[PDB]
């Protein structure tokens, strides 16, 4: 017939085809009580600052500025020198930067090589 | 206008702390997913789904339309990956497997035989441009002082 | 399975009062209260005639709007582009570069006046 | 584009589903309800909207669609849409 | 908050026959195959047993992924339209009319009028709607976003300015 | 002696209308009328320079004001007056003065629709010294302002965030072509120490590997070849007036005309022209295998431009630069109908834009009825009409040469294709029963309407032959050859409309459509934009925070040096500073002080 939709990281699963969706139970049906119910609170205060007469102000998100500061400020203090940090760090580090050493050097030394006996052509190279 | 307490701190190592980091994130105690420790600086923020925002539900009622995301609720650490303008990880009608199989093969069956239509080329029955003037040698930039070998061409 | 009496009664006061909102949206005959400002004598004789709506009398008003944007379009711009070239481009050498016409066998040159000889006879190719 | 008045909209539904076989084309009525006033049921609202969504270009919301089952309170929602104001 | 099984079968036909309509084009081939669809839907209405119901979903969507048309149909005004959100370029928020100039107020004068006296009922009415809503919210906030009415007379019902002043979906 | 006067005057007067906005002085309402008559006394002036060039052939270089005395570099304006710059200029101010008619039919309602005019008179501006440029700075002027322009032009509505998509998205191909034109930049003032075009012909490059595939990626990039092609589909995104002028018939054929403008140093290298038959055989197969089961009503027309796109870059391909400028003309005629008509039908249609909902318009709007048939017609290469002496004489040019093998078979078979989709927008959107919404708002009686679609009507119709007949032969006349593939420019669209026919009644045949996985390829625009547009695009941003910004700058780089002295004075200064106090410790101290540097490292000594 169809064999399936195989999900990725780029390609996500739908609810529609969401096998747990269809699963319903009572554990988790007290569960998705409490999502709306944390949703409504935080659309009642929200809507209370945002139709407030006297507002004038910006109506700061914590969330907001705890993403902030998990993006910005964060990283170190929860910072660890484990091992794989280091592999990603110099993978990522001086990695490239040797990496076009070999590429960059070794241009440089085969054009040198080839224009000190002539080679290479500057018959109307000049604009250096 | 904040205080210091609801803020990202360390990653968290109890239960407790635990419940604790999740309602510093306004989310409940069970679906609080703080970011594995390997080894980078994520602390407790919390780990959302790696959904982009074109996935939530246009109907439903959001405070940034534009972002389709409410306010307060927490909000994924790579907002920005997942926003409409940038990269969207909305589900596809076919599979991602078959997805690249078919591009890959597309462009594979181009390539590897364009190799054997250049090397098969097609053309019609005919000869060299005969041309005068020692195939224009003069015009075609040339050297007119030294003398051309002679490239000519009889009637057939 | 439907409104719960409660939405409906909340949605109607929202209704109304939605009523009145754009009931007050609209603009009455006065605004725009277009405040005064001071008006050129050019469009004063424009009115003047234009009243009586006839062909003529608007083509004219037509003729002189094509008239007028040229000058100020196509005649002033020609005014400093020929300025241009001809007297400080063209003053400057190898600015203004032209291609010399294609002389073919046969043609005259109106300085030197020596015709180009005619090519010799065609393999006389008929079909 | 002219706009859709009140009358022009409950005239414009009231065609659409006197056209409708399954109710009465003498029985319709503006507060007439669907399942009950009319005999339907909930899997006949569903074809009732999108032949509402139809000749009027635009989608209802499926969360407001369930709720969406009665012919006065059908223009209620659609001038509401449009804030189309005689 | 839930989508139970009576709306889930409900949007799953929605997106079934409007998938179908995509296909078919045709009015005369559209129609045949959403009567087909209409009665392939309720041949079995009589299923009681819900685990078969629930079953009953799984053969509805996987092949609608399969059978949904991959270039599926969306008219202009819904998510996925042409003419989504297209409109916002227009669409300024109503608190920037204060802002105007006394020139710019003096430039509509009956709206500015008619403008303050909407900004009166908002201010001596915010009170009575907050206090009417702390008095009706059940402890630990609301259980539930919808919105209480308007439980006495003259009182709007809570939270109504911006759903009301809302702008124009058409503004220019 | 006037030929350079003319010309010039034809690109200073189409600005005046941008700096008498910028004053502010047009009270709206009289300046979209004010900017078309001056496009069009633009026009009317570019005609005589044109009747000028037949009559002899002179083409002049305009080198006016110099730049720069860079050293030897000797940057100046230039603009060079050649058969390419001087009759491409009337053929792109008769489509922008017939659709800058169209644009006020449509936008109405618009509350900007002065600075919509004023943006397209400041495109027109940035196209046209790009036509008309002698140094490749200008090129550069060109080639940069017509994209800048384009992110503001179909990001029109800031609105919608998927206009800024497409925006972001046509800027950053447009952004990934002129990385060769930078290349070519480089190589030509390093090697032929000149920026000028006719310099470098001149210098004669016979082996100009680098430069010339730079320059053929700057052209994939403006024309939307592969690699590089979705960003025309998605232009679609803004105004139609946007999609109708800017990437159905100028900017996308810019690209192409980059080749052309370089096509005396081209053909030195046998090897560059053998990716240029690769590239645009390639996209004309795929452009339109999308055009033929897509739906949107400009995404059929969109994916038909870039086919011809990369059908005409493939005569300068196989040496044929002037026979590529040939079918410039008559592609910006014909498919700006093609786009206006759909347009038009848009507004009509309550701005629906799925054929699923057209049909039943062939009788209701006759004149937008016999517009698009004719319209496809040239587009389907109907004999003795504009797109036949063009389309069809091509292929009679790239059959009968030395060419890749198969390369020749995709514009045979895109050809058969070309005219696929044309069937298919006629039958659905015309053809058929009235599938619109029931409320008929539908109308085209416009004046508006009916002088735009009829300025370019008589020129889909007639210009075919004022264009042929006039212009100098310049090129060798294909005058021998066998009967079937001379007659297969006209055959192959034979089965064109016939096997589409049929496939287009099948709709009509009552019997459920099984989707097809070859289907199911072309909707997804050939599975490209699903692709590319979320792979690369991820992971090199993502790169760009978990090891770009949180792993290396804001962790390792600030750990590295930074920190770590930081912390090496922090670590034990403690123990400097943390002393007990005890005299017997200090004291015992200056003991040991006294002993090493006595007796143990011996200053003394
Ligand atoms: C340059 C852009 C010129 C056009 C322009 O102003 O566009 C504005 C336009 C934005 O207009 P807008 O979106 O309507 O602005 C709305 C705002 O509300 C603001 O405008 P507004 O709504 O109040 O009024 C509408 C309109 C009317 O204009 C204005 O209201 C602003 C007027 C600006 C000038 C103010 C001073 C005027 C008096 C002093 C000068 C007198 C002249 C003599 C000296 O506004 C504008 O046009 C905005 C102009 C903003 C300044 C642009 C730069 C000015 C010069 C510096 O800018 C663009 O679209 C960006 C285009 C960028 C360039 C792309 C192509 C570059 C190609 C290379 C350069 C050329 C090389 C040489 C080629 C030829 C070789 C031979
Ligand atoms: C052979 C050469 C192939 C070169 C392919 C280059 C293009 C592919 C990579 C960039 C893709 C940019 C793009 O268009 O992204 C589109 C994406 C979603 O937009 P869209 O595709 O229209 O889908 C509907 C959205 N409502 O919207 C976005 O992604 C917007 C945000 C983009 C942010 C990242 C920008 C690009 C970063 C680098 C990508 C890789 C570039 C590689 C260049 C190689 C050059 C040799
Ligand atoms: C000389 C002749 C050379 C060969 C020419 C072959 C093509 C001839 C013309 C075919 C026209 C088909 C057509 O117009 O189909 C329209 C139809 C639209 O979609 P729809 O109405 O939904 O019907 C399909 C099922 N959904 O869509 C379809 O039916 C889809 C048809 C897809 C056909 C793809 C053909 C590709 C040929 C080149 C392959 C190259 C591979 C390398
Ligand atoms: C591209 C498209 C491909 C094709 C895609 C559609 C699927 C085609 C294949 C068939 C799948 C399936 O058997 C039928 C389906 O469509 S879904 C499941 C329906 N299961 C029930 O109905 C039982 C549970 N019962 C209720 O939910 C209530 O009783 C109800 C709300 C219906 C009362 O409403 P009442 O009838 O007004």
């Known amino acids: 017939s169809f064999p399936k939709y195989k999900p990725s990281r780029l390609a996500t699963l739908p609810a529609t085809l969401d096998p747990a969706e269809y699963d319903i139970s009572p554990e988790t049906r007290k569960a998705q009580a409490e999502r709306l119910a944390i949703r409504s609170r935080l659309k009642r205060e929200y809507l209370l600052q945002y139709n407030d007469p006297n507002r004038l102000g910006v109506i700061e998100d914590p969330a907001l500025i705890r993403w902030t500061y998990a993006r910005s400020a964060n990283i170190y203090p929860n910072f660890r020198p484990t091992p794989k940090t280091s592999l990603l760090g110099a993978l990522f580090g001086i990695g490239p930067l040797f990496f076009w050493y070999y590429v960059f050097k070794t241009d440089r030394d085969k054009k040198e090589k080839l224009i000190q006996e002539g080679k290479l052509d500057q018959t109307f190279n000049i604009s250096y | 206008h904040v205080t210091k307490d609801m803020f990202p701190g360390p990653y968290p190592k109890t239960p407790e702390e635990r419940a604790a980091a999740a309602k510093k994130y306004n989310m409940r105690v069970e679906d609080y997913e703080p970011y594995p420790d390997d080894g980078m600086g994520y602390g407790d923020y ?111 | 399975s439907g409104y719960t009496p409660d939405e409906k009664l909340r949605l109607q006061q929202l209704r109304e009062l939605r009523r009145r909102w754009l009931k007050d949206q609209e603009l009455s005959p006065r605004e725009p209260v277009l405040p005064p400002r001071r008006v050129w004598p050019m469009e004063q004789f424009w009115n003047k005639f234009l009243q009586d709506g006839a062909p003529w009398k608007n083509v004219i008003y037509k003729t002189y709007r094509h008239s007028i944007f040229a000058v100020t379009h196509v005649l002033i711009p020609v005014w400093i582009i020929h300025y241009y070239l001809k007297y400080h481009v063209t003053a400057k050498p190898y600015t203004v570069v032209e291609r010399k016409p294609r002389i073919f066998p046969g043609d005259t040159i109106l300085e030197t006046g020596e015709v180009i000889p005619l090519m010799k006879e065609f393999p006389d190719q008929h079909h | 584009a002219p706009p859709l008045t009140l009358e022009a909209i409950k005239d414009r539904v009231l065609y659409v589903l006197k056209l409708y076989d399954k109710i009465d084309p003498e029985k319709l009525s503006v507060n007439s309800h669907f399942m009950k006033d009319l005999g339907l049921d909930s899997l006949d609202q569903v074809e009732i909207i999108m032949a509402m969504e139809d000749e009027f270009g635009f989608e209802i919301p499926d969360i407001d669609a369930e709720k969406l089952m009665c012919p006065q309170e059908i223009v209620d929602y659609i001038a509401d849409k449009k804030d189309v104001y005689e | 908050a839930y989508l139970t099984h009576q709306q889930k079968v409900l949007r799953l036909y929605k997106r079934a026959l409007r998938h179908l309509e995509s296909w078919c084009v045709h009015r005369d081939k559209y129609r045949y195959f959403a009567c087909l669809m209409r009665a392939r839907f309720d041949e079995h209405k009589n299923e009681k047993d819900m685990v078969k119901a629930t079953q009953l979903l799984r053969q509805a969507e996987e092949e609608f992924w399969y059978g949904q048309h991959p270039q599926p149909y969306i008219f202009p005004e819904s998510p996925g339209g042409t003419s989504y959100e297209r409109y916002e370029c227009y669409k300024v928020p109503e608190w920037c009319l204060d802002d105007w100039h006394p020139s710019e107020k003096a430039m509509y004068p009956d709206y500015f009028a008619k403008r303050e006296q909407w900004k009166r009922l908002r201010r001596e009415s915010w009170e009575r709607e907050v206090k009417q809503l702390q008095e009706e919210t059940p402890p630990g906030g609301p259980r539930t976003e919808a919105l209480p009415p308007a439980r006495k007379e003259g009182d709007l019902p809570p939270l109504w300015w911006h759903i009301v002043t809302r702008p124009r979906e058409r503004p220019m | 002696n006037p030929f350079a006067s003319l010309t010039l005057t034809t690109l200073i007067i189409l600005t005046i209308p941008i700096m008498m906005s910028n004053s502010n002085i047009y009270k709206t309402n009289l300046y979209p009328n004010y900017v078309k008559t001056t496009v069009s006394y633009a026009f009317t002036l570019s005609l005589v320079p044109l009747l000028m060039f037949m009559h002899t052939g002179q083409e002049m270089i305009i080198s006016n004001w110099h730049w720069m005395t860079l050293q030897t570099v000797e940057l100046s304006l230039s603009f060079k007056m050649d058969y390419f710059s001087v009759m491409f200029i009337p053929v792109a101010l008769f489509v922008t003065w017939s659709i800058m008619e169209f644009s006020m039919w449509y936008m109405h309602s618009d509350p900007f629709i002065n600075r919509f005019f004023k943006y397209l008179v400041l495109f027109l501006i940035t196209m046209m010294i790009l036509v008309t440029a002698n140094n490749l700075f200008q090129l550069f002027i060109g080639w940069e302002g017509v994209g800048i322009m384009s992110f503001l032009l179909i990001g029109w509505w800031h609105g919608r965030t998927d206009a800024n998509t497409a925006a972001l998205q046509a800027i950053l191909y447009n952004r990934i072509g002129d990385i060769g034109f930078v290349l070519s930049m480089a190589w030509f ?151 206006m008509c759909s347009g038009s039908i848009i507004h009509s249609l309550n701005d629906e834009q799925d054929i699923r909902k057209m049909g039943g318009l062939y009788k209701a709007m006759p004149f937008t009825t016999t517009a698009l048939i004719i319209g496809s017609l040239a587009l389907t290469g109907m004999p003795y009409l504009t797109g036949f002496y063009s389309k069809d004489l091509i292929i009679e040019a790239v059959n009968m040469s030395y060419t890749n093998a198969w390369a020749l078979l995709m514009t045979l078979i895109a050809t058969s294709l070309t005219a696929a989709y044309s069937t298919r927008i006629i039958f659905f959107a015309f053809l058929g029963k009235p599938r619109f919404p029931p409320l008929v708002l539908i109308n085209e009686n416009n004046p508006l309407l009916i002088n735009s679609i009829k300025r370019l009507l008589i020129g889909s119709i007639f210009a075919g032959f004022i264009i042929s007949n006039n212009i100098p032969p310049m090129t060798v006349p294909n005058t021998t050859m066998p009967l079937y593939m001379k007659m297969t420019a006209l055959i192959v669209t034979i089965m064109g409309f016939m096997l589409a026919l049929e496939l287009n009644n099948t709709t009509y045949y009552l019997k459920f459509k099984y989707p097809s996985q070859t289907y199911k390829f072309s909707n997804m625009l050939g599975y490209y934009p699903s692709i590319m547009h979320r792979l690369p695009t991820y992971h090199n941003l993502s790169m760009s925070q978990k090891s770009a910004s949180s792993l290396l700058d804001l962790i390792w780089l600030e750990t590295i040096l930074p920190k770590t002295t930081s912390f090496i004075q922090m670590k034990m200064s403690i123990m400097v500073s943390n002393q007990k106090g005890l005299i017997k410790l200090y004291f015992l101290s200056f003991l040991i002080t006294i002993m090493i540097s006595m007796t143990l490292f011996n200053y003394h000594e």
């Open chain 2, 46 to 156: 919390p780990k959302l789904p790696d959904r982009s925002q074109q996935e939530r539900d246009p109907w439903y009622d959001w405070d940034h339309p534009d972002l389709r995301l409410n306010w307060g609720e927490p909000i994924h650490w790579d907002l920005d990956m997942y926003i409409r303008n940038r990269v969207d990880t909305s589900p596809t009608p076919v599979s991602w497997n078959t997805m690249c199989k078919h591009l890959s093969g597309f462009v594979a069956f181009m390539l590897f035989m364009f190799w054997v239509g250049e090397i098969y080329p097609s053309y019609q029955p005919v000869g060299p441009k005969q041309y005068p003037y020692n195939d224009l040698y003069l015009e075609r930039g040339g050297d007119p002082t030294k003398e051309p070998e002679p490239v000519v061409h009889y009637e057939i």
């Open chain 6, 189 to 339: 003032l390093t090697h032929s120490n000149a920026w000028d075009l006719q310099q470098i012909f001149m210098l004669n490059n016979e082996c100009p590997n680098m430069p010339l595939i730079g320059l053929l990626l700057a052209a994939a990039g403006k024309s939307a070849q592969f690699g590089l092609h979705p960003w025309l589909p998605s232009a679609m995104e803004g105004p139609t007036p946007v999609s109708a002028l800017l990437h159905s018939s100028t900017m996308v054929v810019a690209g192409v005309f980059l080749l052309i403008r370089f096509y005396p140093l081209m053909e030195t290298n046998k090897l560059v022209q053998t990716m240029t038959l690769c590239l645009g055989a390639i996209t004309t197969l795929f452009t339109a295998l999308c055009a033929i089961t897509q739906n949107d009503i400009k995404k059929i027309v969109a994916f038909s431009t870039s086919s011809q796109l990369g059908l005409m870059m493939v005569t300068i391909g196989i040496n044929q630069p002037h026979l590529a400028f040939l079918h410039i003309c008559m592609h910006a005629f014909f498919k700006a109908m093609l786009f």
